[PDB]
Amino acid sequence: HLICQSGDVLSARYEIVDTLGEGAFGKVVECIDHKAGGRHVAVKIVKNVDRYCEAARSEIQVLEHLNTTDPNSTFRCVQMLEWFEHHGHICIVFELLGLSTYDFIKENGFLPFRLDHIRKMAYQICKSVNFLHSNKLTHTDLKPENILFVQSDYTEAYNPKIKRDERTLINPDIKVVDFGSATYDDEHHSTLVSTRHYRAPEVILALGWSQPCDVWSIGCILIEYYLGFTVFPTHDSKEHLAMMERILGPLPKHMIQKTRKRKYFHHDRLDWDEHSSAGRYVSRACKPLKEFMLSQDVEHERLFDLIQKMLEYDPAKRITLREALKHPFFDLLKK
Numbered sequence: 356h357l358i359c360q361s362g363d364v365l366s367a368r369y370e371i372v373d374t375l376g377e378g379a380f381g382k383v384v385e386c387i388d389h390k391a392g393g394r395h396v397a398v399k400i401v402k403n404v405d406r407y408c409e410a411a412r413s414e415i416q417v418l419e420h421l422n423t424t425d426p427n428s429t430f431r432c433v434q435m436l437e438w439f440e441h442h443g444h445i446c447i448v449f450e451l452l453g454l455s456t457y458d459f460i461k462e463n464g465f466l467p468f469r470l471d472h473i474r475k476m477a478y479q480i481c482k483s484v485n486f487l488h489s490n491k492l493t494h495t496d497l498k499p500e501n502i503l504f505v506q507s508d509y510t511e512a513y514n515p516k517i518k519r520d521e522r523t524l525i526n527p528d529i530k531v532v533d534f535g536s537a538t539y540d541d542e543h544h545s546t547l548v549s550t551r552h553y554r555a556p557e558v559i560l561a562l563g564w565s566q567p568c569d570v571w572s573i574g575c576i577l578i579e580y581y582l583g584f585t586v587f588p589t590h591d592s593k594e595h596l597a598m599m600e601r602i603l604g605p606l607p608k609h610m611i612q613k614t615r616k617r618k619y620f621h622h623d624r625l626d627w628d629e630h631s632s633a634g635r636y637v638s639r640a641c642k643p644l645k646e647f648m649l650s651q652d653v654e655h656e657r658l659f660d661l662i663q664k665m666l667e668y669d670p671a672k673r674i675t676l677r678e679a680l681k682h683p684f685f686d687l688l689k690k
């Protein structure tokens with residue numbers, strides 16, 4: 356809620372030339388940097404509101420650490436150029452990227468990505484997020500909006516199988532953004548985790564969370580890229596669990612035994628009515644994971660073997676990103 360338009364100058368150097376979208380955090384603008392030779396940059400302008408200010412300060416700390424640790428951006432976290440304050444608002448200056456993977460999907464009629472692009476995107480996401488994991492961090496908020504294309508140019512053509520006209524990226528290279536929720540191992544882990552697009556079961560059941568909850572989110576990301584829509588279309592925690600059970604089978608009894616989240620359960624089973632309005636929906640929208648496959652070719656079997664390991668209920672059993680990078684789905688890239 357900084358009031359602004361094109362022509363405004365921030366920090367007496369950054370001239371606004373375009374909007375780059377908005378959120379509950381505030382807004383992003385594209386600027387000309389008159390003190391870096393006219394370079395175009397993205398500036399995130401944070402709401403003067405306690406919650407978003409705190410996230411922003413923490414993001415700045417994380418970005419300074421990551422960018423000092425990986426000065427060449429070998430691991431594809433967005434580069435923060437600097438930060439400043441403008442009429443009391445925290446402003447974070449980034450290298451300018453292309454649009455988010457969410458925005459690309461929306462502008463492509465919610466059609467999914469092609470499997471070769473998914474492979475490359477999956478590999479880069481696992482590599483970047485594994486880098487955070489090697490530096491004692493958990494992202495916690497991985498979703499298509501927080502993965503951005505480096506360059507978003509595309510070509511356009513009719514697809515016979517899927518009914519319609521389709522955009523195809525020329526280069527699908529990505530970077531990871533949003534470090535406003537990123538948490539170090541030695542920091543407090545909020546067991547009351549706030550609103551999230553994807554919610555790992557150990558997060559919902561409040562069993563403790565750490566790096567494996569990022570692996571869960573990546574599994575959900577990959578299925579969304581594959582289908583063009585999420586397999587967990589809800590904002591309600593109990594309904595999330597109900598959808599998990601249709602897609603992945605019953606919650607493990609040890610996780611149900613351990614959880615303090617008794618609101619979700621009748622004795623040892625989910626407290627869920629399949630004949631209610633919400634039950635009727637869940638039953639139609641959700642089905643066993645492998646039934647979402649669009650082909651039984653070897654390549655699709657390999658993606659789905661990986662997704663399934665990422666969506667393992669038990670966060671100890673769940674595949675790590677180090678293991679994920681060695682999975683046969685990625686062999687094509689290493690030939």
Ligand SMILES: O=C(C1CC1)N1CCN(c2ccnn3cc(-c4ccc(N5CCNCC5)cc4)cc23)CC1
Nearest residue numbers: 375376383397399449450451452453454458532533
């Ligand atoms: O902190 C975040 C997330 C949590 C919001 N970041 C960093 C600040 N952002 C950007 C950084 C660096 N580059 N960058 C490009 C866009 C961007 C690009 C294109 C569009 N369009 C183009 C026209 N169609 C609509 C979308 C929107 C935003 C957004 C960003 C957004 C992602």
